[PDB]
């Protein structure tokens, strides 16, 4: 199968550089364009630039030529996008995508998020939102976790190590005036389960290496 595997999230200071990678497999690397597509938070898709590794030709949207460099390693079937002199406008998800030269993008990588900031990383506090009579309606009860005061995005939240997915709402993070983020994750479960099933929210904040598994205890 055709696969495009991108590198992990980057936090970078203004003025610095980062180099992102896109490892291709499952096809002849030198028969195709590898291009890059930028998506700033909440915004649309911007075509960034491309390389044709077969002959080395590059093509950039004019606004990105100044600070970006596209390269490719044929031996390892890997494309690279280097961003220099980083500014806040460079904070975005960058996807790599395969197409025939100047054609439709049929296979996409999962995206790499770049965050440009001078602020220090901060891990969240995780607090339970315990189920009670006041979170119960009919035969179901709501419970959750408050994930407070972290930077940068994202936190990942799961329930019972990913086993529990139905009835989960993990809300968009909100940027507070402090410059830190908070969010909450909630799940609705059968009230009949509260005494026998344990409910644990698994919170991952990679930038600060914070990992919390918070047991949410039911109230009588």
């Amino acid at each position: 199968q055709v696969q495009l595997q991108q590198s992990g999230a980057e936090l970078a200071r203004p003025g610095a550089s980062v180099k992102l990678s896109c490892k291709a497999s499952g096809y002849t690397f030198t028969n195709y364009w590898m291009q890059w597509v930028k998506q700033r938070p909440g915004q649309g898709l911007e075509w960034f630039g491309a390389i044709y590794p077969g002959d080395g030709d590059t093509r950039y949207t004019q606004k990105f030529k100044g600070k970006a460099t596209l390269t490719a390693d044929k031996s390892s079937s890997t494309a690279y996008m280097q961003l220099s002199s980083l500014a806040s406008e460079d904070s975005a998800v960058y996807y790599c995508a395969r197409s025939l030269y100047l054609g439709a993008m049929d296979y996409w990588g999962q995206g790499t998020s770049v965050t440009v900031s001078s602020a220090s990383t901060k891990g969240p506090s995780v607090f339970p939102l315990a189920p009670s009579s006041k979170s119960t309606s009919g035969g179901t009860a709501a419970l959750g976790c408050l994930v407070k005061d972290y930077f940068p995005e994202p936190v990942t939240v799961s329930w019972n190590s990913g086993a529990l997915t139905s009835g989960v709402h993990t809300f968009p993070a909100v940027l507070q005036s402090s410059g830190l983020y908070s969010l909450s994750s909630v799940v609705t479960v059968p009230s009949s389960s509260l005494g026998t099933q344990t409910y644990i929210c698994n919170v991952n904040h990679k930038p600060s290496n914070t990992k919390v598994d918070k047991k949410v205890e039911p109230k009588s």
Binding site: L102, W108, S135, S137, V174, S184, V186
Partner: protein, 213 residues
């Protein structure tokens, strides 16, 4: 560079309806247009290539038409999971360019929120802060409004709201509202109340608790 204009940033449609999204090129691009679908947290997916061909594995309800400057993407019978942003793209001339996108939203009938309130946890109270959370679950339309009252006093400037994306099965929204207080302030008052207005509610719903209960 060639400008691709999607004049509608938003489009609303019911499950089972036909919907069409337009895309206009600033010069003739013949048939060299592709259409992509992007759902929240996901990479774009190719749906239509060469203006009118369904890409491999794409469901039959998706089609495209057009050639020259005017292009149309069509869903013949919308399914609830089709909420997404749809983008056109040209590759007639370098560099490729994208349209600005059209967000497809799903219409449905009014559904009132289920409202629940959560006092501060003991863990948080230990650290000097008290956050109260009000949850509004599975409502439609999106315009639910939350006000906070502490000992029957309307709060201002100390709460924040977040809303989910439309649910891919039942097309509803959920909303969290968080009231952030100091522990000392929280300890000064008895009644903590979340009040909700919504088109599905004939009168405001109040969910409340007493501190320490």
């Amino acid at each position: 560079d060639i400008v691709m204009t999607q004049s509608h940033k938003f489009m609303s449609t019911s499950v089972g309806d036909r919907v069409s999204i337009t895309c206009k090129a600033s010069q003739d691009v013949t048939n060299d247009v592709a259409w992509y679908q992007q759902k929240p947290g996901q990479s774009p997916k190719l749906l239509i290539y060469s203006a009118s061909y369904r890409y491999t594995g794409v469901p039959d309800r998706f089609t495209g038409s057009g050639s020259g400057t005017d292009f149309i993407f069509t869903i013949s019978s919308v399914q609830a999971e089709d909420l997404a942003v749809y983008y056109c793209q040209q590759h007639y001339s370098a560099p490729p360019t994208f349209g600005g996108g059209t967000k497809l939203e799903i219409k449905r009938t009014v559904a009132a929120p289920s409202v629940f309130i959560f006092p501060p946890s003991d863990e948080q109270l230990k650290s000097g802060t008290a956050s109260v959370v009000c949850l509004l679950n599975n409502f439609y339309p999106r315009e639910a409004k939350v006000q906070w009252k502490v000992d029957n006093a309307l709060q201002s400037g100390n709460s924040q709201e977040s809303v989910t994306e439309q649910d891919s099965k039942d097309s509803t929204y959920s909303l969290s509202s968080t009231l952030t207080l100091s522990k000392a302030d929280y300890e000064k008052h008895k009644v903590y109340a979340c009040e909700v207005t919504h088109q599905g509610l004939s009168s405001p719903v109040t969910k409340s608790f007493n501190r320490g209960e």
